[PDB]
């Protein structure tokens, strides 16, 4: 029931997460407030939380919902700056296609809130939406309301950046290509039927991003269980667009019960890809199990592609665990030659793309093993 969202419980849960996100960012970077946060809104998650990440967006821009009598959220108002107790933070609101499919009315609500923030008569140092929208209105020669466009998604009918697909298929040379794919697919703006492409305004707003942010429940679907999270990650994109080339700080709120993306990748890697409990658990399935391990390594590479969030030691440990250990290598090779070949390919690709630095010895062995499994695959075929 899309008008039910967000509930007073979701509003209250969301305040805690946003205060924690801003506290970490200020404490780390010279007590500087971030100007703009790029964040993803997943539709399934907004069902389950009665609109927690929705409410996080409203909190950031200093808006509160207004349930009528039938518990419908039809309107917003601004929190006054003395109540907010900090600047209005600008937000690039990257809605999933599914969020768009289910919550067009709530995409309209966010939009009203941000335009409201933009038009407010308040000092620019306490209203980063207003500060940006005026600069943006001036640069591009448009209205302030037009300039205060922040609610973006896929084209009507479409899903995903297809950065996941690029990584899974190894069908790309430079990061610019992944970044071009994202900007070409995610630049469709909500406005008062049709998502209008607005690429130049999407790029302009993206260049103002200081922080990237997503909510995830690592207990249910971790950062590396699926490709959809790195698919939606604009961390390296923002660096590549910005005049100053500054990569924004990246965070993940884990809703299991706020970390840097780096911290979250390290936790997931030691819990899943590098953890004996996990990979032995997968190999118990046999043929499918080796596929799951290969998939994990590909999704980890995805985070290298979008964020450079994977420490070299993660790839060195994965190589030591699955390739250098002759016993484990033989089990992979014997159970699933096809997924073993993919894993060997993925280790060589990671070196090829500069995401993994390793010894000549390790690479020679990977090439040697690449030859041997192909020779075996063609053996039966
Ligand atoms: K999507």
Q: How far is the CA of 165 from the centre of ligand 1 (A)?
A: 13
d(CA 146, CA 139): 12
Residues ≥6 apart with Cβ < 8 Å to 171: none
Cβ contacts of 118 within 8 Å, gap of 6 or more? 129, 130, 133, 144, 145, 147, 148
Cα 101 to averaged position of ligand 1 atoms, centre (Å): 10
Give dist(CA 39, CA 151) in Å, integer.
Answer: 10
Q: What is the per-residue DSSP string for 16-80?
A: HHHHHHHHHHHHHTTTPPPSEEEEEE-HHHHHHTTSHHHHHHHHHHTEEEEE-SSS-EEEEEEPP
Distance set, CA 249 to CA 21, 26, 79, 315 (Å): 11, 11, 27, 22
CA 352 centroid distance within chain: 24
Expressed in angstroms and rounded, the spacing between residue 95 Cα and the centre of ligand 1 is 7
CA of 323 to the centre of ligand 1 (A): 35
In the structure encoding, which two tokens stand for residue 152, read together?
Answer: 């973006």
Please, which residues bridge with residue 39 across strands? 93, 213
**What distance in angstroms lies between residue 96's CA and the mean position of ligand 1's atoms?**
4
Number of residues in the chain: 381
Q: How far is the CA of 158 from the centre of ligand 1 (A)?
A: 8
Backbone dihedral angles phi then psi of residue 259, each to the nearest 5 degrees: -125, 160
Burial class of residue 193 (count of CB atoms within 10 Å of its CB; 0-12, 13-18, 19+): exposed
Distance 186 CA to ligand 1 centre (A): 8
Q: How far is the CA of 173 from the centre of ligand 1 (A)?
A: 24
Q: After which residues is the chain broken (C to N over 2.5 A)?
A: 192, 257
Residue 12 C-alpha to ligand 1 middle, in angstroms? 27
Comparing C-alpha atoms, which of 325, 373, 307 is closest to residue 346?
373
Q: Residue 143 contacts by C-beta under 8 Å, 6 or more apart in sequence?
A: 137
User: How is residue 92 annotated by DSSP?
Assistant: E
Cis-peptide, bond into residue 297, ω within 30° of zero: no
**Number of alpha carbons in the 13 Å side-chain half-sphere of residue 342:** 20
> How far does residue 163's CA lie from ligand 1's centre (Å)?
11
Distance 274 CA to ligand 1 centre (A): 29
Question: What's the 40 CA to ligand 1 centre distance in angstroms?
Answer: 9
3-state helix/strand/coil string of 255-307: CCCCEEHHHHHHHHHHHCCCCHHHHHHHHCCCHHHHHHHHHHHHHHHHHHHHH
> 124 C-alpha vs ligand 1 centroid, how far in Å?
33
CA of 42 to the centre of ligand 1 (A): 8
Ligand 1 centroid to 161 CA: how many Å?
7
Distance between Cα 27 and ligand 1 center (Å): 32
Tokens of 317: 């440990």
Phi, psi dihedrals of residue 247, rounded to the nearest 5°: -70, 125
Closest to 4 in 3D by CA, of 47, 41, 40: 47
Using the mean position of ligand 1's atoms as its centre, give its distance from the Cα of residue 43 in Å.
9
Q: How many CB atoms lie within 10 A of CB 324?
A: 13
The CA-atom distances, in angstroms, between 264 and each of 230, 261, 272, 299 are 13, 5, 12, 14
How far CA 376 is from CA of 268, 283, 336, in Å, comes to 33, 21, 11
CA of 44 to the centre of ligand 1 (A): 11
Ligand 1 center from residue 162 Cα (angstroms): 9
10 Å Cβ neighbour count for 251? 24
What is the 98 CA–ligand 1 centroid distance (Å)? 6
* C-alpha 41 to ligand 1 mean position (Å): 9
Q: How far apart are CA 235 and CA 261, in angstroms?
A: 10
Hey, what are 374's tokens? 């192909």
Resolution (A): 1.6
Distance 123 CA to ligand 1 centre (A): 36
Q: Which residues pair with 250 in a beta bridge?
A: 212
Residue in 260, 254, 356, 250 with CA at minimum distance from that of residue 300: 356
Give the technique used to solve this structure. X-ray
CA of 303 from ligand 1 middle (Å) equals: 17
Residue 99 CA to ligand 1 center (angstroms) comes to: 8
Element (H, E) at 197: strand 196-197
Spacing, Cα 231 to ligand 1 middle (Å): 9
State residue 354 phi and psi, 5-degree precision: 80, 10
């Amino acid at each position: 029931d899309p008008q039910a969202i967000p509930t007073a419980a979701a509003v209250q849960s969301a305040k805690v997460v946003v205060d924690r996100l801003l506290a970490r960012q200020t404490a780390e970077n010279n007590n500087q407030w971030p100007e703009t946060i790029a964040m993803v809104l997943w539709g399934t998650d907004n069902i389950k939380t009665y609109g927690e990440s929705l409410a996080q967006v409203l909190w950031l821009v200093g808006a509160r919902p207004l349930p009528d009598s039938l518990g419908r959220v039809n309107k917003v108002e601004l929190i006054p700056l003395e109540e907010l107790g900090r600047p209005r933070i600008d937000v690039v609101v990257n809605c999933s296609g599914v969020f768009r499919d289910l919550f067009i009315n709530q995409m309209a609500l966010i939009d009203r809130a941000i335009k409201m923030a933009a038009e407010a008569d308040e000092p620019l140092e306490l209203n980063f939406i207003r500060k940006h929208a005026l600069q943006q209105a001036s640069e591009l020669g448009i209205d302030l309301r037009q300039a205060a466009t922040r609610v973006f998604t896929n084209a009507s009918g479409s899903y995903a950046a297809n950065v996941n697909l690029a990584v899974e298929n190894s069908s790309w040379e430079q990061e610019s290509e992944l970044q071009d794919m994202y900007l070409s697919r995610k630049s469709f703006a909500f406005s008062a039927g049709t998502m209008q492409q607005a690429r130049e305004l999407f790029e302009t707003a993206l260049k103002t991003v200081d922080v990237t942010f997503q909510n995830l429940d690592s207990s249910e679907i971790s950062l590396t269980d699926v490709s959809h999270y790195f698919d939606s990650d604009p961390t390296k994109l923002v660096a590549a667009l910005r005049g100053d080339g500054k990569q924004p700080k990246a965070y993940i709120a884990d809703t299991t019960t706020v970390r840097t993306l780096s911290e979250t990748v390290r936790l997931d890697s030691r819990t899943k890809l590098l953890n004996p409990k996990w990979y032995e658990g997968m190999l118990a399935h046999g043929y499918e199990g080796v596929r799951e391990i290969s998939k994990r390594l590909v999704n980890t590479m995805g985070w290298s592609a979008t964020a450079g969030a994977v420490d070299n030691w993660v790839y060195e440990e994965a190589n030591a665990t699955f390739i250098l250990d002759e016993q484990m290598r033989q089990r992979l090779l014997n159970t699933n030659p096809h997924s073993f070949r993919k894993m060997v390919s993925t280790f060589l690709e990671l070196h090829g793309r500069g995401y993994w630095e390793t010894s000549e010895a390790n690479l020679e062995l990977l090439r040697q093993l690449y030859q041997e499994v192909e020779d075996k695959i063609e053996g039966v075929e």
